[PDB]
């Protein structure tokens, strides 16, 4: 039985988005690549290298024209004709545009590809932009986070495979099952926020009682995500706030990598 083909291209990535897959449990990475999809190109895992792996990619783009899901992690640098990320002697922006032409679906995994992320922050030395900016004529599904819970991606792919279309998306083309609500509008520390029960410094009495982290700079009030419900790693109880640290807003453009850790969020 044939498995749906996937082409994964890394641009200005830290590899954290690929590494999220090694934490996944439903499916595990081994079940993903052996049972769920055919991973036709991925530079981190491929046996082949160099000319052989570039031959793999050209052959798969041809063979699976119109059928593959294209996934990109990392931002795409446009400054100086694309030379801040060169693969096989060509700018990554060109590899991505060529692969996008025959894609059945296109996914920006991670904040960097979804909206520029950390790579585009501050003075943006390389003119890093999002995948949607590189592909104005295409619908790009955005799966932000740095990195997202891998199941935000895997259940998006599963919806495409099982039901034949993408999951429902919000106005930023983010799947609603994962990004449909502010973290602060589904956070278990909301009772403490409501009562004015706040941690003031790490290790203080309030912090050691699991109180709200708003005055530590929690960006939950301005960040869409599922971090408080789905959480991370499938062990139970694991997300940054539960561990004791404010949300930094890594999912959300203009929050993560722009605002200081301790800078207060705006509350609706």
């Amino acid at each position: 039985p044939q498995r749906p083909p996937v082409i994964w291209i890394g641009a200005q990535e830290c590899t954290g988005c690929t590494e999220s897959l090694l934490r996944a449990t439903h499916p595990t990475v081994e079940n993903l690549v052996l049972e769920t999809i055919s991973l036709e190109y991925h530079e981190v895992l491929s046996a082949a290298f160099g000319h052989q792996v570039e031959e793999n990619k050209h052959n798969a783009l041809e063979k699976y024209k119109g059928q593959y899901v294209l996934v990109v992690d990392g931002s795409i640098p446009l400054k100086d004709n694309g030379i801040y990320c060169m693969v096989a002697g060509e700018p990554i922006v060109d590899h991505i545009r060529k692969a996008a032409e025959g894609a059945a679906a296109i996914i920006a995994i991670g904040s960097c590809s979804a909206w520029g992320g950390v790579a585009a922050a501050g003075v943006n030395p390389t003119g890093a932009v999002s995948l949607q900016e590189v592909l104005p004529g295409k619908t790009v599904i955005n799966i932000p986070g740095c990195p997202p819970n891998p199941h935000n991606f895997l259940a998006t792919v599963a919806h495409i495979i099982t039901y034949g279309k993408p999951p429902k998306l919000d106005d930023k083309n983010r799947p609603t099952f994962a990004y449909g609500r502010l973290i602060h509008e589904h956070c278990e520390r909301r009772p403490h926020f409501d009562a004015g029960r706040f941690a003031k410094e790490f290790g203080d009495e309030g912090h050691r009682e699991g109180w709200c982290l708003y005055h530590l700079g929690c960006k939950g009030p301005e960040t869409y995500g599922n971090c408080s419900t789905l959480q991370f790693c499938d062990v139970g109880g694991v997300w940054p706030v539960a561990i004791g640290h404010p949300c930094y807003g890594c999912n959300e453009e203009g929050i993560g990598f722009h605002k200081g850790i301790h800078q207060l969020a705006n509350v609706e």
Partner: protein, 551 residues
């Protein structure tokens, strides 16, 4: 005579190009090139020192944790902060568990397919494969039934005609030397490794808040609130959960990874005599356990000209000898300022001009230690530990040597460690030793909480005038890492990362001296220049991370 390019190098982190001149079937000269840059050093400039770690952690997700920890250490250095001992225990568990994940994935997911032929595994007899491991390993998942199930997964993948990431690999290449049975064993262990690495990351997640990219650090300690009697914080139940995962790592590491390492050497003994990258080695001490950022569980030092007897120990992250030695040059890199720069005075001004054999050819800078090229990473760290007379390291290395002896009738001497396989062996030794670090630090934390110490964080102050310089050292999976922060008027005025893959992958330096990747390739035989598997074997041994190297 001919010139080849390997671009992309796969089964590494990031974007790497390798060029080689081949003469008379052997590499005569090599070039390593990092082909992607982000400017992370510039992105973090002008921010609050407390914020840096969350940004620069994103230098790399393979070696997640490392840049976070080095950054907070740099701020703490500049500010003269003593980290609470509970925060050290937590930081240490995270780094040790992370590194366990990292080394396992390197050996199996990144490196094994250089040495293992999966097609050949189809010809294997599973019963003979299992029989080969009797008296060699006590691992519980080496039965003929396990191997038959694994062989059938391979058969099914091949039967589908969609090989995906296993396609067009180096199957039947003359440098592939493992018997069918051993190839099958390796694939079974590749899959089993995935379970072990997931357990290691569960340890990391429970303290870090997630992984990749932990979120429990602070300049001043950690954000974990210790309270055995508290709901929703780091209580005894949560600690027991952490311990349950720490306990699951040792058997695979000791009975599979350690054994496979000795077996690869037994089948590929010529790889003990090639891939030497350098004659100088550097590591920093790691896992501080006192209240003043010291008393490290693992030792550090500098070895010059491979001489272990006259090495210089490094016992402090404030060691001025270590600090003053480090410079970087961009003569053969795509930056403007070329003369060697101490990182507190470092610049990172991009100056791309395309590839040139004799000019600039990489986004990686060229680091030196008192003007010398140095290899960092697990080979360095093992050699330093041997030089220090560390019994744990001697004994662990001796276990690998004994397996090798049993299989071949030959021994392994220290001279044979300066090699592709020696580097791999160092990494395995490190992974094995880290399991005792995890047990030691978990126990230390439990004991200390029991004395009534729940302190995790000391709030810093940052003078609004003055210029303060700090450096944070860390022994990362790939070797010595350092972050260098200058604070002026309350904000970061300079930030420079010198990363272990920078040391090893950096291009020719200000004196045109060759760095470890480039040096290691000289003399590599290449049977088929179109499919230069031998080159990739040596390069993979260094565990390249080019997001790290370039940042």
């Amino acid at each position: 005579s001919q010139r080849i390019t390997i671009d992309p190098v796969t089964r590494i982190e990031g974007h790497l190009r390798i060029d080689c001149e081949i003469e008379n079937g052997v590499v005569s000269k090599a070039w390593a090139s990092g082909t992607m840059w982000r400017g992370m050093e510039e992105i973090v400039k002008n921010r609050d020192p407390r914020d840096a770690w969350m940004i620069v952690q994103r230098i790399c997700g393979v070696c997640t944790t490392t840049h976070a920890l080095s950054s907070v250490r740099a701020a703490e250095s500049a500010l003269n902060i003593d980290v609470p001992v509970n925060a050290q225990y937590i930081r240490n568990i995270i780094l040790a568990a992370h590194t366990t994940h990292d080394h396992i994935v390197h050996f199996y997911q990144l490196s094994a397919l250089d040495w293992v032929d999966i097609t050949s595994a189809l010809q294997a007899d599973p019963t003979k494969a299992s029989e080969m491991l009797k008296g060699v390993s006590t691992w519980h998942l080496n039965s003929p039934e396990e191997f038959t199930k694994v062989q059938n997964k391979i058969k099914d993948l091949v039967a589908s005609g969609q090989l995906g990431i296993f396609a067009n690999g180096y199957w039947g290449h003359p440098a592939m030397k493992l018997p069918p049975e051993v190839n099958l064993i390796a694939v079974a262990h590749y899959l089993q490794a995935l379970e072990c690495q997931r357990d290691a990351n569960r340890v990391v997640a429970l303290l870090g808040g997630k992984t990749p990219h932990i979120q429990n650090l602070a300049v001043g300690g950690v954000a974990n609130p210790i309270n055995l009697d508290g709901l929703g914080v780091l209580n005894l139940e949560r600690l027991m959960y952490i311990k349950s995962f720490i306990d699951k790592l040792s058997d695979f590491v000791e009975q599979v990874y350690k054994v496979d390492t000795a077996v690869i050497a037994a089948f590929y003994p010529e790889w003990l005599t090639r891939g030497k990258g350098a004659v100088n080695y550097l590591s920093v001490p790691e896992f501080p356990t006192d209240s003043k950022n010291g008393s490290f569980l693992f030792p550090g030092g500098y070895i010059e000209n491979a001489d272990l007897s006259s090495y210089r120990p490094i016992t402090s992250h404030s060691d001025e000898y270590l600090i003053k030695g480090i410079q970087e040059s961009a003569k053969h890199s795509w930056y403007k300022d070329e003369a060697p720069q101490a990182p507190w005075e470092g610049t990172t001004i991009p100056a791309y001009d395309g590839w040139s054999d004799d000019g600039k050819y990489s986004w990686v800078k060229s680091p030196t230690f008192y003007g010398k090229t140095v290899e960092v990473g697990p080979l360095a760290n093992m050699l330093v530990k041997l030089a220090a007379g560390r019994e744990s390291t001697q004994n662990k290395l001796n276990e690998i040597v004994a397996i090798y002896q049993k299989l071949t009738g030959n021994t392994l001497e220290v001279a044979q460690l300066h090699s592709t396989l020696g580097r791999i062996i160092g990494r395995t030794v490190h992974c094995c030793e880290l399991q005792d670090i995890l047990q030691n630090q978990y126990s230390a934390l439990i004991t200390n909480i029991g004395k009534g110490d729940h302190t995790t964080f000391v709030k810093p102050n940052i003078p609004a005038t003055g210029e303060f310089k700090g450096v944070g050292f860390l022994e990362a999976p790939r070797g010595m890492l350092s972050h260098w922060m200058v604070i002026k008027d309350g904000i970061i005025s300079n930030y420079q990362a010198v990363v272990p893959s920078t040391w090893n992958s950096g291009p020719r330096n200000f004196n045109d001296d060759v760095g470890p990747y480039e040096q290691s390739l000289v003399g590599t035989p290449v049977a088929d220049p179109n499919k230069p598997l031998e080159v990739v074997r040596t390069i993979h041994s260094f565990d390249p991370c080019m997001a790290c190297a370039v940042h």
